[PDB]
Amino acid sequence: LLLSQVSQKLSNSESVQQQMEFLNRQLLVLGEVNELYLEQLQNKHSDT
Amino acid sequence: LLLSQVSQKLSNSESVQQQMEFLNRQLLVLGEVNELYLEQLQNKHSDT
Amino acid sequence: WFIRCRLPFRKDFVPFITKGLRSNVLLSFDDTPEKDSFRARLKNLHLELTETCLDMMARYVFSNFTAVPKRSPVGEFLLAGGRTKTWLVGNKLVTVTTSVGTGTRSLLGNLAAYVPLLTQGWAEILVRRPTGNTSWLMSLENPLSPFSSELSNALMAAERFKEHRGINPSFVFLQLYHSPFFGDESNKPILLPNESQSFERSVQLLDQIPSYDTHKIAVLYVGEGQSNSELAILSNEHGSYRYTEFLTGLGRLIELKDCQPDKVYLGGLDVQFTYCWHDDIMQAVFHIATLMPDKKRHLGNDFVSIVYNDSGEDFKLGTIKGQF
Amino acid sequence: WFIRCRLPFRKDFVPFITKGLRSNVLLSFDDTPEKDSFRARSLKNLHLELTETCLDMMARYVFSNFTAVPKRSPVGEFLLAGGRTKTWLVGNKLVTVTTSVGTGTRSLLGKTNLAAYVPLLTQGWAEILVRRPTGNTSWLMSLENPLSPFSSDINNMPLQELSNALMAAERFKKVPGINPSFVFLQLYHSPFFGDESNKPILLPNESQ
C-alpha cells in the first residue's frame, strides 16, 4: 500500500499545487473582466 | 494509520480531479468573453 | 466637494464638518446632540439634514464607489431564493439572505455527498443606508460540528467569485449584533414580520426611489418669427446650426431601448438621443427637445426650460403655456 | 444539553432559559439584569459573567451549530496576506477587519504601468473575524459595488496589458490599498448611537 500510495501521491501533490495556482489565476481573470465590463458601459455610455 | 491518511487524501485528490478539470473549461470561456469585450471596446472606443 | 476631494486627508475634514454642523444646531434645541465616533477612527428638518450629511460623510469617506450594488450573475444564481430576513436597527436597514443548498457544480456534475454543506456556507448581507445601499457576499470558514451534526477545501470557496462562467439567516445578523446588556430602544435591532406585506411593500417602495438627486429640464428651440407661436415652438424641428452645435456638447446621452435599464430616467420610452447630463450626486435628464417627436404634457410639465432664442426679442414668460 | 438539543425547537427555551437565568439573579443584584432575550430581535460580578457566557454560548449555537475554530482557505491567505488591518471592541465582542493589497498577484508579476494599480484590481476583497467568549468565527467578503465610474478614476485603468500580464502569469505556472476602517464604519454607523457603552473602540494598532 505504501508503494502504491507514494507512486500516486507525488503526482497528487504536484497536480494539486497546479490545481491551486490555476484556480487563483482564474479568480484574478474575473476582476479584469469586471473592469472591462464597466469601461465598456463608460464608453458604451456615449451613443454612435 | 499514516498510510490510511495518505491513501484517503489520494482518493480525495484523484476524486477532486473532475472538479480541477472543470476549472480548465471556465478558463476558455473567460478568455473568449474577454476577447469579445475587448473588441467591443475596440469598435465603440477606438472610433473617430 | 467632499466627493471629488483627493482620498488622503479626507478624514480630518469630518472633524471640522461635524464641528460646524453641531455648533450650528443647538441655538434652539430640545435634544442632547450626538457627535460622531471618528475619534476612534423647524429643527426637526435641521436634524434630518445633519443626519443625511453624516450619512454621506461616512459612506463616502475613506473610499468612493457606486452608490448601488450589482451582484454577479452566478452570484444571483447561487443565493437564488435563499432564505432571507431583514432587521431595522437604527436609521439603517440591514438585510441578509442565505443559500438553499443547490450546487452549481452539482448541476455541472464522489464528493457529491456534502454539496449541501459546501453550498450552505455562502450568504449575502446588504445594508440600505440613507446615502445609498451596499452589500457583500459572505463566505463561511468555521466548519460544522463533526461530533454532533477529507473534503474539498479550496474548490469549495472557489465557486464564489465574480461573473465567472437552508441555514437560518438570523445567524450572521445576531453574530454582528449581540452586545446583550443594552440597546433597549435607542439602538434596538428590530425584525420586521415576514408576513407584514405592508412593511415589505413599504421597504420595496423605499427601494423604488433613487439615491442620487433628480433633475429634468426642457430644452426648446424657437425660431425667428416663431416668437409667441406656442405651436411652431413645439412643433419645430431641425433647429438652427449654432443651436444644434451647443446642444451636442451638453453632457452625455443614452438611447432608449433594451441596452439602457430603468436605472436612468426612462420617461417616455416611446422613441431619441435625449441627451442626459450625469454624475453621481445629481442626475439631470433633458426629457424633451425639438428632437423628441402626453408629449405635450411631457414638456409642459418640466419645471424649468432652456430656450434657444434665434430671434429678436422673442420671448416673455407669459408666452409659454407650460404651467409647470 | 442545549448543544445536544435539536436544531429545530432550539430557540424555544431561549427566553425561558434567560428567564430561568434572570429568575436566579432575582435578589443578588439588579443593576442591569434586563431580559435582553433575542426573541424580540428574532461576588455577584461572577454571576453577571455567568449570565454573559451562557447567553453568549446560546446565541453562538442558536439557529445552527458550528465549531468555534476558523481556518481560512488558502485563497483567503493568498488574497489578504499581509493585508492592511484594524481591530475594534464594539462591546465584549472582539471585531477584526483585514483588507487585501493584492500581494500574491504582484507576486505573479514579480512595471509601474501595471504594478502601480495592480492592487486596485483586487482591492475589493476583505475579511472580518469576530472573537466572542464562545470562540471566534469569521467570513471572507467581496464588496460588489463597482468604483465611481467617474469620481474614482476607474477609466484610467489600462487592462489590455493587464490581460497580457495575466497570460504571462498563466505561462509561469499613496496608500496601496483601501482602508479596512471603511467596512467597519459601514457596518456600524447609526449616527445617533443611543448607548454610550455600545460606542465602538479602536485599540491603537501601533502601540503593541
Residues of chain A that touch chain C, judged by Cβ-Cβ distance less than 8 Å: 19-20, 23, 26-27, 30-31, 33-34, 37, 44-47
Residue C32 has a CB neighbour count (10 Å cut-off) of 7
- Asked if C279 and D150 count as a contact pair (C-beta separation under 8 A), the reply is yes
Count how many residues are written for chain A: 48
Question: For the CA atoms of chain C, what is the radius of gyration?
Answer: 27
Query: How far is Cα D138 from Cα D127, in angstroms, rounded to an integer?
Result: 7
Measure CA D46 to chain center: 29
The residue of chain D with its CA nearest to that of A24 is D75
The residue of chain B with its CA nearest to that of D166 is B31
DSSP class of residue B16? T
Query: How far is Cα D207 from Cα C96, in angstroms, rounded to an integer?
Result: 36
Measure CA D99 to chain center: 11
Count how many residues are written for chain D: 208
Residues in contact with C74: Cβ distance below 8 Å, sequence separation at least 6, in sequence order: C104, C159, C161, C163, C164, C165
Residue C174's nearest CA partner among D10, D37, D13 is: D37
Residue A27's nearest CA partner among B27, D168, D36 is: B27
Pairing of β C305-308 and β C276-278: unpaired
Q: Which three cell numbers stand for residue C28?
A: 434652539
Provide the Cα torsion D145, D148, D153, D157; round to 10°.
40
- Bridge partners of D94, per DSSP, are D131
Residue C82's nearest CA partner among C121, C123, C116, C137 is: C123
- Interface A:C, Cβ pairs < 8 A: 29
Diameter over CA atoms, chain B = 71
All residues of chain B having their beta carbon less than 8 Å from the beta carbon of residue C108 are 22
Query: Given an 8 Å threshold on Cβ–Cβ distance, is C65 in contact with D148?
Result: yes
DSSP class of residue B47? -
Half-sphere exposure of D104 (CA within 13 A, CB side): 16
Q: Which three cell numbers stand for residue B38?
A: 475587448
Buried b (16+ CB within 10 A) or exposed e, C250-259: eeebbebeee
Residues in contact with B17: Cβ distance below 8 Å, sequence separation at least 6, in sequence order: A15
Half-sphere exposure of D57 (CA within 13 A, CB side): 11
Query: How far is Cα C119 from Cα C116, in angstroms, rounded to an integer?
Result: 5
Residues in contact with C290: Cβ distance below 8 Å, sequence separation at least 6, in sequence order: C219, C220, C221, C236, C237, C238, C239
Measure CA C111 to chain center: 41
DSSP class of residue B48? -
Query: How far is Cα A41 from Cα A35, in angstroms, rounded to an integer?
Result: 10
Angle, alpha carbons C157-D125-D188 (nearest 5°) = 110
- Asked if C86 and C98 count as a contact pair (C-beta separation under 8 A), the reply is no
Mutate to test the interface with A, among C161, C259, C260 (most CBs of A within 10 A): C161
- Name the phi and psi angles at A25, rounded to 5: -65, -40
Residues in contact with D147: Cβ distance below 8 Å, sequence separation at least 6, in sequence order: A38, C64, C65, C66, D153, D154
Residues in contact with A22: Cβ distance below 8 Å, sequence separation at least 6, in sequence order: B20, B23, B24, B27
Residues in contact with A17: Cβ distance below 8 Å, sequence separation at least 6, in sequence order: none
- Bridge partners of D84, per DSSP, are D99
Query: How far is Cα C64 from Cα C2, in angstroms, rounded to an integer?
Result: 11
Query: How far is Cα C16 from Cα C26, in angstroms, rounded to an integer?
Result: 17
Residue C269's nearest CA partner among C231, C243, C298, C246 is: C298
Q: Which three cell numbers stand for residue C73?
A: 450573475
Residues in contact with A35: Cβ distance below 8 Å, sequence separation at least 6, in sequence order: D121, D154, D157, D159
Query: Given an 8 Å threshold on Cβ–Cβ distance, is B27 in contact with A32?
Result: no
- Bridge partners of C134, per DSSP, are C127
- What HEC string does chain D produce? CCCCCCCCCCCCHHHHHHHHHHCCCCCCCCCCCCCCCCCCCCCHHHHHHHHHHHHHHHHHHCCCCCCCCCCCCHHHHHHHCCCEEEEECCCCCEEEEEECCCHHHHHHHCCHHHHCCHHHHCCCEEEEEEEECCEEEEEEEEECCCECCCCCCCCCCCCHHHHHHHHHHHHHCCCCCCCCHHHHHHHCCCCCCCCHHHCCCECCCCCC
Provide the Cα torsion D193, D194, D198, D202; round to 10°.
30
- What HEC string does chain C produce? CCCCCCCCCCCCHHHHHHHHHHHHCCCCCCCCCCCCCCCCCCHHHHHHHHHHHHHHHHHHCCCCECCCCCCCHHHHHHCCCCEEEEEECCCCCEEEEECCCCCHHHHHCCHHHCHHHHHHCCEEEEEEECCEEEEEEEEECCCCCCCCCCCCCHHHHHCCCCCCCCCCCHHHHHHHCCCCCCCCCCCCCEECCCCCHHHHHHHHHHHHCCCCEEEEEEEEECCCCCCCCCCCCCCCCCCCHHHHHHHHCCCECCCCCCCCCCCCCCCCCCCCCCCEEECCCEEEEEEECCCCCCHHHHHHCCCCEEEECCCCCCCCHHHCCCCC
- Name the phi and psi angles at B12, rounded to 5: -65, -45
Query: How far is Cα D70 from Cα D60, in angstroms, rounded to an integer?
Result: 14
Amino acid at D132: R
Tell the residue number behind the cell numbers 455527498, with chain if given. Answer: C113
- Bridge partners of C133, per DSSP, are C128
Residue C177: C-alpha distances to residues C187, D20, D33 (Å): 11, 23, 19
Query: How far is Cα D107 from Cα D77, in angstroms, rounded to an integer?
Result: 13
- Asked if C152 and B16 count as a contact pair (C-beta separation under 8 A), the reply is yes
Cα of first residue to Cα of last residue in chain C, in angstroms, is 31
Residue C213's nearest CA partner among C284, C263, C265 is: C284
Q: A10 touching D, CB under 8 A?
A: no
Mutate to test the interface with A, among B8, B35, B45, B48 (most CBs of A within 10 A): B45
Query: How far is Cα D105 from Cα D121, in angstroms, rounded to an integer?
Result: 9
Diameter over CA atoms, chain A = 69
Amino acid at D93: K
Q: Which three cell numbers stand for residue D200?
A: 465602538
Q: Which three cell numbers stand for residue C184?
A: 433597549
| Strand, helix or coil for residue A46 | coil
All residues of chain D having their beta carbon less than 8 Å from the beta carbon of residue A34 are 146
Query: How far is Cα D64 from Cα C23, in angstroms, rounded to an integer?
Result: 48
Which among C54, C143, C180 has the least Cβ separation from residue D36? C180
Q: Which three cell numbers stand for residue C110?
A: 464522489
Half-sphere exposure of D79 (CA within 13 A, CB side): 29
- Bridge partners of C128, per DSSP, are C133
- Asked if A13 and D121 count as a contact pair (C-beta separation under 8 A), the reply is no
Q: How was this structure determined?
A: cryo-EM
| Strand, helix or coil for residue B15 | helix
- Asked if A28 and D173 count as a contact pair (C-beta separation under 8 A), the reply is no
Residue A42 region by backbone torsions, left for phi larger than 0, else alpha for psi between -120 and 50, else beta: alpha
- Asked if B3 and C141 count as a contact pair (C-beta separation under 8 A), the reply is no
Mutate to test the interface with B, among C115, C156, C165 (most CBs of B within 10 A): C165
Residue A12 has a CB neighbour count (10 Å cut-off) of 20
Query: How far is Cα C61 from Cα D179, in angstroms, rounded to an integer?
Result: 10
Q: B34 touching D, CB under 8 A?
A: yes
Q: Which three cell numbers stand for residue C230?
A: 406656442
Query: How far is Cα A21 from Cα A17, in angstroms, rounded to an integer?
Result: 6
Pairing of β C282-288 and β C213-221: parallel
Q: Which chains touch B (3 or more CB pairs under 8 A)?
A: A, C, D
**A17-22 contacts, C-beta under 8 A, 24 or more apart:** A18/B20, A18/D173, A19/B16, A19/B20, A19/B23, A19/C154, A19/C155, A20/C154, A20/D74, A21/D173, A22/B20, A22/B23, A22/B24, A22/B27
Q: Which chains touch C (3 or more CB pairs under 8 A)?
A: A, B, D
Angle, alpha carbons D109-D114-D117 (nearest 5°) = 110
Q: A27 touching D, CB under 8 A?
A: yes
The residues after which chain C has a C–N gap greater than 2.5 Å are: 41, 109, 149, 165, 271, 293
